[PDB]
Structure formats: structure tokens, C-alpha cells
Structure 1
Amino acid sequence: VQRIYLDNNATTRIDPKVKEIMDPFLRDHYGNPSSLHQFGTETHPAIAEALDKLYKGINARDIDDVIITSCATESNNWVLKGVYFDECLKKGKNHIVTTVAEHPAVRSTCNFLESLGVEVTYLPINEHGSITAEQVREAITEKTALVSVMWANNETGLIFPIEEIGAICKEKGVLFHTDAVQAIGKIPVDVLKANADFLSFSAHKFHGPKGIGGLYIRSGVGLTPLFHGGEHMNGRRSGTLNVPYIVGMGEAMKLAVEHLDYEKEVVGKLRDKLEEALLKIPDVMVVGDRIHRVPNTTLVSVRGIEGEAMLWDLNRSNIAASTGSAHTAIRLSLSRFNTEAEIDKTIEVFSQAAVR
């Protein structure tokens, strides 16, 4: 069998250099970074270079934290539950603004915050398929604790106006969090440009293992731990370090940014080649704006064919894709690993499956 992988917004294959760089921490360099003996101290240099690559990747500065969590889900839960006690209960600012595009755990966590009496404004998504920065302006009551807006949407591919929201946030003096999880590797990420207080990512969406992610925290800005115990990550997230994954995510991050041009030049081009052809066949439209999108994603609907049905069929010809809602549409999410071969084939296999 020869399968075609087109589900990268949902997870990605660990890069071989990533797989390789981790291996020695699964073999012989197994000690606890916290221990003082040689087995501990050995791990130090490689953790440090890993972390370096992480800050380097998002343009964090030496005085900021990028804390290693066990996934973006953890990161996001930690921001929202954190600013709840720090700013909603204690500073009394009982409002958080966010969007409806936000992945479940963000929405879901907010939901639970309402259950404890938080006022949460869930910004509606427009016909262009986006949010506009001006919308965010409109919703910041000065008793607002936090704005949270995803950097790009995992369905549409659609990049939101993050740098602008950073401004609005700076100006209005409110805390800014962006879930960047579908931006890393797809387009450049600059926390500095973003006036982000808080930024989230998950390793597995840029060719690292599943089971690790990060939260960037701006220097000075504070966030009551979601994992108390305070023994690791300057006390901000206790619990023993996942050395292998950290070292991996480091490399993953590094490589992800190095391929940033290739993502735009080649992967985006492969996305347009796929999207062109598909769009040509009868009553098949792309959901949302086609202009401000991460390079690798396209979300198509075929009038009359349920998306769940299209996916089932595609699976049978060994092509892996997912569903985004619009009823439901097909989510085709490329990586640096797809070639034109696989694209051509996909267009063939799509079309034939369509008419049936």
C-alpha cells in the first residue's frame, strides 16, 4: 500500500531528525534533570538548546518564559483558569472576551468559568469567515480581564488579525492571549509584534510528538499555576520534565521555522494546485476567505454530498482528511511531506468519489 496524508491540522508525522534527536533520552540519558548527580546534569545542555530554539522560534526574549506543558490543551486551560483567580476573583474584573472559532478546551473552559459567574463574550464569526479587530475593541468593558483570540483557525485556515488585537489590548491595558497552535510552522510567529501576554502551542502540529506543548508568558505578567508543586519551570508548572519530548519539540520548532519559506513557496502552491482543480468540478466551493490563510489548508464543501460521507470513501482509497462545519465540509491539510504526485492522485480520487 501507498497512503496519502492530508490531515496535518489534526496531527503530523514526527520529523525523522526529531525522532532521532530524542532517541538518546529514551536510551541512555534517562536521568531526572532535577537530580544533582551526573545523570541529571548531563541532560542540562540539551534541554537548554531545546528551550533556546523555542524562544528563537516565537521571538520570545530572555526575560520571558516559555513554559513546557503537556499540550496546548493544558496551556489554554492554564491561561483561562489562571486569570480567573488572578483577575476575575481577586482584581474583580469579571469579564473575558474570546471568539467562537476557539478550539473546544478554550470555549469549554470559559463555559465552566461562566458556571462560576464569569461574563464571557463569545465574538461571532463574520461572513468573510473571520473576526475583525474592531469587534474586539467593541467588547472590552474596562472590567475585562482577558482577550483570547486564536492565531489561525484550525478549520478554515483563516488567519485572524492578531497584531492589531495586540495594539487594542496594549492601548486598553488588557491581558492578551493567543492560541497559536495552527500558526506555528505555517506562518511566522512573533509574540513581540503580537503584544501577546500569553501564547499557546502544541508540538504535534509541527512535526513533534503528541504530549507536549508550550505556554509563552511575557516578563512580569503572572499566572497562578495550574500545576502547583512549584519544583520545575521556575515554579510555574511543577512535575518531572519530559526530557525526550522537550528536546524533540526543540528540533521540531527549529525545523518548522526553517521551512517557513518552503511552506509559502511549495506547500501553499501544492494547496492551490489541489484547490484549483477541486473547485472546478460542479458545485464545490471553499469555506471562507481564500486570501488570509495559512498556506497548507483548504476546506471545501460539495453541495449534496455530506462531508462525513466523502471522507469515508476517501479513506477507502487510502487518503486521510477530516471534516470542518459550514451541512459539513472536507478539511484538507497539507504538510511539507506531500508531493505533487500525491496531489494529482488526490484530485483524481476526489472527483471519482464525488460523482458517486
Structure 2
Amino acid sequence: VQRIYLDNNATTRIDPKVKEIMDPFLRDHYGNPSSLHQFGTETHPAIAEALDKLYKGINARDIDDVIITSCATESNNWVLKGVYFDECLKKGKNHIVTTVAEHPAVRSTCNFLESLGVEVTYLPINEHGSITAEQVREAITEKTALVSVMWANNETGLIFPIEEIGAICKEKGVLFHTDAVQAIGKIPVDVLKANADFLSFSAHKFHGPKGIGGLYIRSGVGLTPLFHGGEHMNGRRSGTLNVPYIVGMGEAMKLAVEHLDYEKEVVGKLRDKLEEALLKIPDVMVVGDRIHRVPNTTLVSVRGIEGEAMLWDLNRSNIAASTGSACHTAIRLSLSRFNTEAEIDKTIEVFSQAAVRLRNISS
């Protein structure tokens, strides 16, 4: 059989070179990087090279931190709860601005903080499926400890006004976090252009393994640890380093940024071919803006067929995609550098056949 993977915003396939670079640390180089002996120090070059690729990938400076976490969910929790303790409690800045589109690792955590008494503003989405930077300016009070806005939305692919949001936060003296998991390898990410204080990412959205991520922390910015303990990561996040996955995530970041052109010029054109072909189908329409999106994502709605019905039919033909709320659920088809034009043609065909058969059965 030959299956087609079009659910890359949910997770991605590890790049074969990433598997390759990880293998020696799953085998004979198993020493603890914190060890003073040869098994420990022999890992230091590869870890340093992995860190360098991570820093350069997002334009972090030598004075900034790029802290290894176990996933973007950890990074997001660490930002929100660290700021809750540092600014909301200790400084009386008991207000946070975020959006209604945020990933559950941000929204669900904010719901918890609200239960502790934090005031949380969930900025509403516009008809374009996006947030305006004016919205964050409206919502910032003199009590706002932190603004958290995702760089790109995981369901629609829509890119948010990070640069502007960062300028507004800087002129107002407010800490800025961006959950940038969906942007890595899709668009260039520059923490300096964003004026971000915090930036989250997760390797498995860009062809590294599940269960590692990163938190960028700007120089001089504090954040009470979420993992207290040993002295790992300049004392900011304790726990024995996940050597293999650090090395892999570094390589995944490098390869991601090296393929940025290809992602926009080849993968984006496969996304357009897919979307344009699917819009010749009657009742089919894109949910949200078709401009200011990452190259790999299309979220289409089909007049009477639910998203899950299309997903179940599509899965029977070994094509993997997922749902995305529409505002009844829509179909998110999300591509990568590993898809081919043959697969898009095939998906056009199977998607169309499924559409016509599910309508005929619908009445």
C-alpha cells in the first residue's frame, strides 16, 4: 500500500538525516552531559553544535537563552506560570492578554490561572480568521504582565501581526510571548524582529522527534523555573539532558530553515494546486483568509459534509488529514517537503470522488 500524509500541522515525519544524527547517542555515546568523566564531556561538542543551530534558526543572540524543554506544552506552561508568579503575584500585574485562537497549551493554562484570580483577556478573532495588532493595544492596561500571541494558527495557517504586536508591547513596557510552533520551517522566524521576550517551539512540527521543544528567553528577562532541581540549562530547567533529541532537534531546525525557499516556492504551490482544484468543487470554500498564511496549510469547508465524515472516508483511502473548527467542522490538509505532485493529484481525485459520493448519500 501507498498512503498519503497530509496532517503535518498535527505532527511530522522525522527527516531521515535527523534519525541518522540521533543514532550514535542512542548507542555508544550515552554519557550524561553533566558527568565530569569522558562519557559525559564527549557529548559536549554535539550538544554545542545543536544549540548553535537552534539559536541561528530563530536569530537568538549569544546573550539570550534557548532552553531545551520536553515540548512546546512545557514551554508554554513555564512562560505563563513563571510570569504568574513573577509579575501577577509579586508585582500586582494581575492581567494577561492572549487570543481565542491559541493552542490549548496556552488557553487551557490561562483558564487555570483565571481560577487563581488572574484576569485574562481572550482577544476575539476577526472575519479574516486573524487578530489585529490594534486589539492588543486596546486591551493592554497598566496591569498587564504579559501578552501571548501565537505566530501562526495551527488550524488555518494564518500568520498573526507578531512584529507589530512586539513593537506595541515594547513601547508599553509589557512582556511578549509568542507560541511559534507552527511557524518554524514555514516562514522565517526572527525573535529580534518580533521583539519577543519568550518564544516557544516544538521539534515534531518541523521533522524532529516528539517530546522535545524549546523556550527562547530574552537576555535579562527572568522566569521562575517550572522544573526546579539540578543545575541543567543555566539553572533554569532541571533534568538530565535528552542528548539524542537535542542533537536531532538542532539538525531539524537547520534543515527547516534551509528549506524555507522550497517550502514557499514548491510546497506552497502544491498547496495552491490542491486548494484551487478543490475549489472547483461546488460548495467548497476556504475557511479564513487565503493571504498571510504559512505555505503548507489549507482549511476547506464543504457545504453539507462534516469534516469528520470526509476524514473517515479519506482515511479509508489512506489519506491522513484532520479537522479544524469553522466559523461545521472543516478539513485541514497540511503539507510538507515530503509530499509530491503525484500525491496532490491523487488527493484531488479521491477528495472529489468522496465529495460526490457523500453528497449523493446525503439525500
Calculate the TM-score normalised by the size of structure 2.
0.97
Runs of 4+ in structure 1 deviating by more than 2 angstroms, as ranges, are none
Displacement of 1:231: 1.4
* 1:225 matched to 2:225: yes
Check whether the contact 1:71–1:214 (CA below 8 A) recurs between aligned residues: yes
For the residue of structure 2 that corresponds to 1:98, the secondary structure is strand
Displacement of 1:16: 0.4
CA RMSD of aligned residues (A): 0.4
Aligned residues: 355
Check whether the contact 1:6–1:334 (CA below 8 A) recurs between aligned residues: yes
Check whether the contact 1:33–1:41 (CA below 8 A) recurs between aligned residues: yes
What corresponds to 2:281 in structure 1?
281
CA distance in 2, matches of 1:128, 1:11: 25
5+ residue gaps in structure 1?
none
Displacement of 1:32: 0.1
CA distance in 2, matches of 1:158, 1:69: 26
CA distance in 1, matches of 2:198, 2:185: 18
1:85-134 residue CA offsets vs partner (Å, 9 max, x unmatched): 00000011000000011001211100010111000000000001100000
CA distance in 1, matches of 2:197, 2:26: 34
Q: Any residues of structure 2 matched to 1:172-211 within 5 Å, and which?
A: 172-211=172-211
Displacement of 1:5: 0.5
Displacement of 1:193: 0.2
Check whether the contact 1:230–1:236 (CA below 8 A) recurs between aligned residues: no
Check whether the contact 1:12–1:207 (CA below 8 A) recurs between aligned residues: yes
* 1:354 matched to 2:355: yes
More moved, 249-258 vs 230-239? 230-239
CA distance in 2, matches of 1:30, 1:105: 31
What corresponds to 1:335 in structure 2?
336
* 1:75 matched to 2:48: no
Q: Any residues of structure 2 matched to 1:106-121 within 5 Å, and which?
A: 106-121=106-121
Check whether the contact 1:155–1:324 (CA below 8 A) recurs between aligned residues: yes
Displacement of 1:232: 0.1
For the residue of structure 2 that corresponds to 1:247, the secondary structure is helix
Displacement of 1:230: 4.3
CA distance in 2, matches of 1:142, 1:340: 52
1:230-267 residue CA offsets vs partner (Å, 9 max, x unmatched): 41000000000000000000000000000000000000
CA distance in 2, matches of 1:166, 1:10: 27
For the residue of structure 1 that corresponds to 2:333, the secondary structure is strand
CA distance in 1, matches of 2:105, 2:264: 29
For the residue of structure 2 that corresponds to 1:85, the secondary structure is helix
5+ residue gaps in structure 2?
357-363
CA distance in 1, matches of 2:36, 2:121: 48
* 1:242 matched to 2:235: no
CA distance in 2, matches of 1:71, 1:351: 37
What corresponds to 1:58 in structure 2?
58
1:251-301 residue CA offsets vs partner (Å, 9 max, x unmatched): 000000000000000000000000001011011000000000000000000
